Structure 1
Amino acid sequence: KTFKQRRTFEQRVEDVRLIREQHPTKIPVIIERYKGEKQLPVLDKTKFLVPDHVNMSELIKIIRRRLQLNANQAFFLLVNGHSMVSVSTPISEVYESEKDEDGFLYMVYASQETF
């Protein structure tokens, strides 16, 4: 069902290596809906190539637009399994510290702070 269950570790590593070769300025991001989530919709895809200069505040705005949310729908994003300490950090810096061993950056979204 989840990305890590659909693709082998070998397959995920090789896909991150191809993104380095073909899209060298992009961060490879996996974005999934929390398995408990009732309110927010699912995304149209799983794997996102994010320009490495955007900060987390802008990435939250990008994902809200992609989900076509309105102003009073709540949205919380986990990175590497946990809350973001700051939304001001450039995603290139977030990637270097929070990347998975497969080389993806894993994010999960919910309408409650309680995942």
Structure 2
Amino acid sequence: PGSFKERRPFHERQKDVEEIRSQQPNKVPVIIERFDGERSLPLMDRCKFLVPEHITVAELMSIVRRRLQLHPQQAFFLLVNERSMVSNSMSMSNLYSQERDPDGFVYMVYTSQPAFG
């Protein structure tokens, strides 16, 4: 739609990752976007993140929660390649090889909707 992958073509995305990797070791490049059609969570101004590699999916959710200023009791899920991870205790490092896109980013989307609502 107006998603990052639509705003920037594949080779441009791959070059961007290549450049940042040459500059910033031990950080994982992550695209974080609001799930299409989500209406109860805010937008972030940025979607391109550099995340220190030891941070887990659950910890990243805490970081994004803070930035969105969500109420602590608000439903919030961060999906990796649009689906739930088996464990949110995986570090950015350890899921990178598994979940990264060929362009070098890991793509995540956030939503307020649980798997079965």
Structure 1: runs of 5+ lacking an equivalent: none
The answer on 1:88 being equivalent to 2:79 is: no
Aligned equivalent of 1:109: 110
Aligned equivalent of 2:56: 55
Distance in 2 (alpha carbons) for counterparts of 1:72 and 1:81: 23
Aligned equivalent of 1:34: 35
Aligned equivalent of 1:69: 70
What is the one-letter code of the residue matched to 1:111? S
Distance in 2 (alpha carbons) for counterparts of 1:66 and 1:25: 22
Aligned equivalent of 1:79: 80
TM-score, normalised to structure 1, is 0.95
Distance in 2 (alpha carbons) for counterparts of 1:83 and 1:30: 16
SS at match of 1:109: strand
Q: Percent same amino acid among aligned pairs?
A: 57
How many residues align? The count is 115
| Cα displacement string for residues 81-102 of structure 1 (whole angstroms, at most 9, x for unaligned residues) | 2111101111101111100011
Aligned equivalent of 1:8: 9
The runs of at least 4 aligned residues of structure 1 exceeding 2 Å deviation read none
Q: CA deviation at 1:57?
A: 1.2
SS at match of 2:22: helix
| Cα displacement string for residues 5-48 of structure 1 (whole angstroms, at most 9, x for unaligned residues) | 00010100000001111112110000000111111000120100
Distance in 2 (alpha carbons) for counterparts of 1:102 and 1:16: 7
What is the one-letter code of the residue matched to 2:61? I
The answer on 1:22 being equivalent to 2:20 is: no
| Cα displacement string for residues 44-72 of structure 1 (whole angstroms, at most 9, x for unaligned residues) | 20100000011111111011011111112
Structure 2: runs of 5+ lacking an equivalent: none
What is the one-letter code of the residue matched to 2:91? P
Aligned-CA RMSD value: 1.2
